[PDB]
Structure formats: C-alpha cells, structure tokens
Amino acid sequence: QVRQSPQSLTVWEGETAILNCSYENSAFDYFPWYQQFPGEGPALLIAIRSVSDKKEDGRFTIFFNKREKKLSLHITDSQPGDSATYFCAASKGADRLTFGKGTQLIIQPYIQNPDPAVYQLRDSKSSDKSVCLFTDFDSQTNVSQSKDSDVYITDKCVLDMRSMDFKSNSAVAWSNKSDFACANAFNNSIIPEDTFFPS
C-alpha cells in the first residue's frame, strides 16, 4: 500500500510545491514518481533508491526517510506548466510497481493588473440565449458552485494572450430560468467590491 497526501493541492506560482508520499512495506527499495498531464498517460519524472536520502534533478528533488518510511517530492519555483497529477510508486527487488492514488497539482498564476468584471454575452445565433462571464479577477478570489440546480457555474480558468503579455482568469455561468440575472449569478462567490457591473 502506498499513500499520498493530499488529494489535490493548489500553490502560487513561484512557491515550492510539496507532495507527500508514505508506504507500509519496509522492504520497498525503489521509489519513482510519475507525472501525468491531462489527456496523457503518466511518465517517469524522477526516482529514488532507499540506499539514498535525496535525489536532485533541477527544480525537482525527492527527500527520502527510510526509518519513517516517508517520502517527499519537492517542486521549486513552480510554473503553470507544472500543473498535473503526480504519482508515487514503490518497488521491491525490481518486481512490479504499486502506485499511490496520486496528487493533483494546480499552480496559480499572478495577475499583474486585476480588473474584476461580470459581463453578459449574447448568443451568436439566437439573441434570446445568454451567458455570464466573471473575468479579470485576481487568482486569490475563489468561485464556488451554485446553491441551486438551474444555475450552473464553471470553475475558474487562466487564459494567456501570448500575442501580448497578458493573463487573466474567467469563470462562466448560465441558466434556463427566465428570472435569472448576471448581477447575482455570482453573489454566491466572493467578489471584490470594486467589481465592474455594466449593462
């Protein structure tokens, strides 16, 4: 049995992400970590042998403690591109691996010029239909799901306009209730008081 903590872990970009692993069988001697990006298969990132209490490879290092049968992957100066799922596995005398359940890694970007706003957008084919966009907020602000069916709210999302040097967050929300409006579409979520509500 191989146990990882936590299930998911959010970390500001530039911070050092710390992924914990722990195992039960003292005989385990080989501990590789796999990195899995969305839509892909996992791939060996970095690995350690119990003979050693450390393995460094750039921004990635594994700290190993044989006595406590505890184990740790450190990711320093972390980058949006480090976002992924990281597996901890173990081996005994080169036989088949046993994987942990894995840890999801979400790295948060810094926004240089936050400018929170909820815009309403019209369909491109049927004006009657509409969607609400919460956009340009700081990565600090947390969007919670809806306290009711009928109203859907996605999770937040950083898009990057590489043409320029611009990143920004957004979340969407929509509904089929005819008594639905953008103004309180997000009143469930925190919102900076200085948020822009046009229309």
Next chain:
Amino acid sequence: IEADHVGTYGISVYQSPGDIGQYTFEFDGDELFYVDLDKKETVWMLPEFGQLASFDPQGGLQNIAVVKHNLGVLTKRSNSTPATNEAPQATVFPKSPVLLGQPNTLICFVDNIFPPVINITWLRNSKSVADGVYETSFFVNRDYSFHKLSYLTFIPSDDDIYDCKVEHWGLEEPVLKHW
C-alpha cells in the same frame, strides 16, 4: 571457491523443446524452495521455514521469462549446438536404520543428470510401487549437471527386493540400482 556458506539465491533452468522450466533457492547444498510455475506459489521444503521466511513467486516467474528468452538467443548464436546426453548414476540407501516390520524411507540419489529430464520410478519385487513417493527438485552440480533424490515409504521385509529404476536419454536401456 572457498567459503563457510554458499546460498544460490536464484537458480533458473530452462529447456527446449517442451517449455520445461525450474526455479529454486539452495543453501549449503539444500533446497530452500522451488516456485511452482503453474500454481505460481513458492513451496518451501521445510514447512517451518515458510513460516519464518518468504519469497514472491513472481521473482522466480520473471527470471524464468528472462531465461526462456536468453535460451532462444543463445540457441541461434551457437548455431543450434544441442546438449550432450550424460549417463546418470544412482545409489539407494534407507533413511533410517533398517528394522524389519518398521516403516522406513528408501532413498534413491541419482546424479550426473544432463539434460535435466529423467524418469525415476520404484520397483518392489519387480512390480511398480509408489507408496508416498516424493521427488526432490534438480540440484545443481559444479560441472552443470544435476542430481535428484526420490523417496519411498516402505516396511522392511526379507521377502522383498527393491530396485530404483532410472530412465534417461543418455542410457541405451533403463538402469536399476538393486537394494
């Protein structure tokens, strides 16, 4: 080659044709275990040993796989140089002092086995006998032939003559060590 103790921590054996494999541990001349390739379990010779020590049978199954491969590679590489038959040699002796009327174990030690494919069967007064028959695994020899022991539980009578019958490819006709 001097030493106080020698463990052979993994012996892998593979034959073609016929897909015959064997995988064992030995220590100072005695078999700690073989891995059953079909059941896929480690079988200790001494049960009390299996209670204190363990071995993942996979460890042996993978080794066999490697060795099955290597054999093929080495078969071509040698240009199909086949093995040479040896004539095996047998010796019969009882496990305990022979007292008439008391159940004992007759033991047939067959040596210089190569290749390791052999028929070892027991005869009593010329008729086949199989009482509690047990066979060891092929033990390795320094020269890369094998030896092997069969067992037979029997009551010692003066009205009984035992033979150990041994069949091998290196023997024009079966050889029987009388006892």
Next chain:
Amino acid sequence: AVTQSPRNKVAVTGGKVTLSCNQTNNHNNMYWYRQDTGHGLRLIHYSYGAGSTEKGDIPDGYKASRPSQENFSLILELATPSQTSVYFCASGDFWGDTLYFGAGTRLSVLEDLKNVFPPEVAVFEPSEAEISHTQKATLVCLATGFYPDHVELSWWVNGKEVHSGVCTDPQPLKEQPALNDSRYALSSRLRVSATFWQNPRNHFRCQVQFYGLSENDEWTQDRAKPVTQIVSAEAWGR
C-alpha cells in the same frame, strides 16, 4: 511507443470489449492499468512475454492475452458498468526502472444506451462593455447536454486551430448532479483583441469532438443516432 486501441469506446452491459495495446519498444513486460478518482492507477493484469500473463491487484472480471511480444490485449468478457474507466497500457524492460505508458482509453459501459447524446454547441459573442473597457473581446463556448463525457473542445480562427488566449474547463459539470446518468456541460473561453473581433473578415469557430456510438450500432429511437461526430458553433467579427 505504446499505442492503445481504441482511444474511446461505448459498450453495453453484457457486451464484449477487448482493448488492445501495441508496443514498439522491444520491451518484454507489458501492464494493463485503470484509473478512477479515489483509486489512482490500479494494475489489472500484466505479462513477462508472449503466451503468458499474471494477475495484478484487481484481475477480477478481466481476462488478458499476450499473443505477441508487441501486443497485449485486455478482454472484458461480460462488460459491466463497474468497468467504466480510463484504461492505460504500459511496457517496460525486464526489471525495468522505467514504465512507458500509452495515451489512454476512455471506456463507458452503459446500462440502457438511450442515455447517449451528442453535444449542443453555442458561441456567445463579446460584450461591447468588455470591449470598450479593456479593448479585449472574450468569446465563450458552451457545449451542453452530452453523454458520456468523451469530448474534446478546440477553437478555430480563420481556419486555423488556435491555443493562445484559450482556456477550457478542466472537466465537464453535471447538468443534474442528483443523477448517476446525468448529462454534461462544458465551456471554454477564447480571448482576442477588440482590434480583431471588430474585423468582420475574421471568423471564430468552436469545435467539440464527440465520441459516441459506433456507426454499426443498433439504434431504435426517434432522434438521430448519437454517433461520433463534430459539432460546431461559429461567430463572425463585427
């Protein structure tokens, strides 16, 4: 390389499903895993070489076949909803420090097969208010009412797939979370400059690849059979 086939599949309960895997690495060992939230990677069967296989931690319900050094197949003899998963094949050397995985196979085993719907796609045009206040224009794409959740969303600008200025939801949401058969929705943002949305020569397309029924599947219903298809939404610069 390790290539799995198929990459997406919809089966019915009781049906038969073989997932194959070809490996080009001259590797002797191959492994078949599944992946489900709250269980991570779980070994099902593996094999040291042609003609032989070995039970993993959760072999129950799966058969396995290694007819080749190249190929390792996983056989679902009686497919059940519990086997609904993303499946990964892997290969390695004898004793190998390093496993090499394929890309994945999404499998949905469904009870009724009438639950299968393709996505309704729509694109919402930028707000003049966002434009006048930021000189940026965000398009939103909404893909709704699809099941299962085997889709891929891409944005297209004047005939060319784009990545810059795009971000899609990590995963789809349920339109009716109370239901273990709920249909899904998914959204995506594409942001460009108002100095580019305003040009009416520019067209922006939102594409959803949907994986659904085999074209040789039996379909007995009143709506068009929900086969594998592309559904799109297009907006024109103004």
Next chain:
Amino acid sequence: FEAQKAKANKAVDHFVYQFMGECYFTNGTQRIRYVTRYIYNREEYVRYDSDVGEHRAVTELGRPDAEYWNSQPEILERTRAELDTVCRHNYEGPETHTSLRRLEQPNVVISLSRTEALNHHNTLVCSVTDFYPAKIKVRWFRNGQEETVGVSSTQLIRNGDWTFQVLVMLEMTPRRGEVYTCHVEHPSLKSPITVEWRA
C-alpha cells in the same frame, strides 16, 4: 523475513539454459563474494564476479552480453548491487532465522550384524541419523578406551530433506562382560550422546 533473488540479464540480439547467482559467505558476512553465472548447454559463457566488478565473457559466446550489460548503467549498477541486496540481505535476515539456526539432534542406535555368538567375530554398526548441521564426531569405545582399528565410517550422507546420516562400523569379538559404547558429538547436543551395547 523476505528473500531476494539475483536478476538475470537479457541476452543481446535438446537445449538447456541455466542462470544462477551465488553468494559465497566467509566469517558470516565479513567477507562476501558474489558470482553470477550464465550457462548454455553446460558451458558457462558469461559471468559477474564481485571481485572483477563487471560482467566478463567466459567464452566467445559471451562477448555480446558482457560488453552490453556493462554499457547500460541501469544494468551494471543493478547487478553490482546484488552483493548487498541479495547476499548480505538474505544472510542477515531469512538465513539467520532458518538454515543458520536449524538444530536437529542425531538418533543413535547400536546394532549387531550377525546373530551373537560369544568368542566369535561379529560387527557392530552405530547408526547416527536425522541430524543437522553436518559437523559431527562419532567414536567407538570398548570398556572405556577408544577404538581406531577395525573401525570404519561412511562419508557424510546427505538425505536431501535437510538432515544428515553417518554410519560407523566396528569389527569386534564380543566377550562375556564387555561394554561397547558409541559416542557422538554434534552442536545440537548439550552433552555428548553415548549409547551402550553389553556383550
């Protein structure tokens, strides 16, 4: 206590193939020598030897493998490591607790080859059976003095069941009055075992 195995290396691109890893212990684990042997049709064609520190071709056949196995660090380090991970590990763990601690007491039974007639030649056989380990001393006595003449032991007989046997014959002439004693020393014996046969 879990046993580890030597790991056969993959050959590079009636027939009998044999692979083994041998651990040669001297003075416990003070000195360990580790040898790996690959044998095709009873010809060792490659080997690893902890003294050389790498695979060496033993014959023409072994050339491909030795050079390759030595050229893959994952492979060379893996074979070298077995001196610790196989030999030392197995000795200090599983071995110390099984074979290394096995202690089976000898069964001692005296026996008369021919029906007894006083003042006639006959021969006693001292069967020493079912013992372990192999080190053992067996001596005859007549009225308290050692016999060396007309005495003959078999070699050590290996039973194959983790026990040993040795038979010690004595040519003698039973006189009225005299006492023959078989005297055996083995490490599973607190004090020597004597068995007597009175003429």
